[PDB]
Amino acid sequence: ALEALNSIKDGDIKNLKALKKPPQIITRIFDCVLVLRMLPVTKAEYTDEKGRMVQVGNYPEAQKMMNQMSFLQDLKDFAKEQINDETVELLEPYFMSEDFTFENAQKGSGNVAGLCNWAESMAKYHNVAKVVEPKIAKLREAEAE
Amino acid sequence: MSKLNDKHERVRARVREAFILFEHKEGSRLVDFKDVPTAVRACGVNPTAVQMTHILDQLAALNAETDATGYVGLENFELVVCNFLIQQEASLFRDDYHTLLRAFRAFDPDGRGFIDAESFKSLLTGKGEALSEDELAKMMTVAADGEGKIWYEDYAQRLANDGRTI
């Protein structure tokens, strides 16, 4: 999962910059990655569409956060012993829905598939670290005993 | 109910008009805390020292939840003044002249019709809501005549007719 993050250092940034205001269907997963990065978002049914009933991302927030040059550091700087409690709290409805499928992601463009793969890899990393923490605690207790 | 809501709207308009008179800035919807004892008396009521202290404490408690800028919000001041005025009208009926006449008669056991100004000043200085010497001098200036006799009937009539428009 970690090696899948640094390989997307600049191609996704360039493609998203040239994407020219993408629609909300992939703005949803873009804001998913944004919440994983833990940046402020407004919380309401903004531009809500009937049929999904999911917290679809806003229109101008994606444009505001697209031109930021810090995305390379966002996709690079991370460490262990993380809980990602806020992200696992706010990312449930996107897992409940079925609009993040790989087949749906590849329909848009190459950057969509890479961003979805990055989000999935980071979620798997968070889950595996959450499993690891009590395990390593038990290992150190057993070593002391 | 609709009638209750309309009456509340009228009371809101009246209390907003009263609040605007003590605004620190025009349209700021804020009143200085030091003028709150002066502003509460402006609404046709006569709060006691205990009542004003309770109003100040309630306003401070309400403003503790918001930014402590030293100014009282229009909504909070309006709610507090509305509650106090409604309670005063409900309990103390508007027989203000008779209430003040009884209060003044409490100081005249013999029913002579007049009360000594120096004794009045001493009693108000030592008893009840102890007031300042400037305030006492204002009392003698307003009430006492050239002979030093305070006709409590006329003084109570003047006190009750203090421009309070119902």
Binding site: - | T38, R41, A42, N46, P47, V50, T99, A106, G128
Partner: protein
């Protein structure tokens, strides 16, 4: 009866003093307001040409 009267007269006088002081406060504030804002009218410059 004398003890009761001695207590009652003092309590009544204290209550009357409190009431009259509060009502005088209100009357004083209302006299101050009735002394309306006769602010000094600043004589603005009378521009003649335009």
């Amino acid at each position: 009866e004398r003890a009761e009267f001695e207590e009652m007269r003092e309590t009544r006088r204290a209550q009357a003093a409190v009431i009259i002081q509060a009502w005088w406060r209100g009357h004083k504030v209302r006299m101050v307001m009735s002394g309306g804002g006769k602010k000094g009218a600043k004589k603005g410059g009378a521009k003649k040409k335009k």
